[PDB]
Ligand code: HEM
């Protein structure tokens with residue numbers, strides 16, 4: 063492929079500035095499965111020499127379905143940490159369901175599904191609709207500001223608070239922890255320590271479990287979460303369901319600003335297809351990885367036991383063989399077989415319907431209260447090699 067020597071698709075230096083869209087396109091054309099070498103000390107906490115870059119939608123789906131071969135446990139699924147991270151600090155992440163394999167995963171997912179029934183999620187609708195309307199009304203009243211802080215941040219957090227039934231008075235500290243929980247190497251957040259925050263959040267969760275959806279999770283059925291498993295569950299929600307949905311909202315609104323005919327159409331009909339096009343466009347999770355438990359032949363490439371494969375959802379969601387005009391933002395996109403929520407399989411995002419609800423509610427409220435919003439200046443991108451994040455974005459709400 064035509065790429066610079068030493069190029070690394072997980073390099074946080076790239077994501078601080080841009081998405082490497084041209085480079086992913088080059089792989090899909092010239093080398094759709096490509097060994098991405100990493101030199102010593104430059105592997106984002108991994109010291110195995112590199113990973114297979116997976117750029118095609120059908121390959122990502124194949125990996126995701128074959129969790130019997132492609133493990134989330136052996137190396138976790140986050141493909142990029144600070145270069146100096148201790149191995150122990152990666153391995154401790156195996157205590158969240160996301161980074162477990164069957165049968166352990168199977169048991170926890172079965173229990174935790176009690177929190178994501180369409181009944182549990184559907185019950186949040188009216189409180190989240192109310193919140194979304196008030197958020198959008200207060201942003202409009204401010205006239206201008208940081209869209210991320212004023213519009214994108216709060217509703218995901220309130221969706222988590224509401225699912226868990228957190229008392230109103232505790233939501234401030236919960237949101238504080240939650241916002242320091244996902245690791246990044248951004249200089250704006252160099253003072254944050256996800257370790258301290260995670261200990262404190264687990265402590266708060268376990269006390270909540272002691273004092274008692276939380277009920278359904280900790281009451282025996284005799285399967286239940288232990289108090290510590292409930293703590294780990296709450297940490298996982300903070301990493302899985304916060305900045306993900308937030309970045310879908312920011313990048314969805316960036317796409318509307320860049321595609322005004324789509325925003326006009328959205329404002330009229332609020333179509334059913336919008337939320338998934340927003341998620342495909344935004345691809346909040348750029349990439350998650352797996353580790354081969356045995357040799358496996360994938361589209362003619364001989365993947366070897368113990369090797370990492372990185373599923374670039376950001377490539378796969380723009381796969382020209384699957385999506386007509388993939389670089390066109392189309393809120394009526396159909397079909398839309400995107401992998402923003404992952405490939406179908408054991409680990410497929412359990413919060414996907416909650417995320418869609420959150421997106422629809424906030425975008426309805428934005429259309430209602432700020433139909434003429436326009437950007438003032440450029441989005442500020444997060445320095446992360448796996449999260450596709452916007453830290454700030456100044457906009458004129460009127
Ligand atoms: C637009 C927003 C979101 C995006 C893009 C997103 C994306 C993802 C992806 C890519 C995965 C891994 C799938 C796989 O490995 O096959 C995942 C898993 C997960 N997500 Fe989401 N997610 C979002 C919102 C949420 C929300 C709102 C919640 C809950 C509050 C949530 C909870 C989870 C959990 C608990 C898992 C782990 C599932 C497992 O390992 O079995 N996510 N998500």
Ligand SMILES: C[C@]12CCC(=O)C=C1CC[C@@H]1[C@@H]2CC[C@]2(C)C(=O)CC[C@@H]12
Pocket residue numbers: 140154155156157158243244245256257260261294297298301
């Ligand atoms: C918050 C965290 C780090 C930053 C990041 O990006 C992802 C995670 C999720 C798993 C956490 C971990 C911090 C340490 C935790 C709390 C444990 O001791 C068990 C699970 C693990």
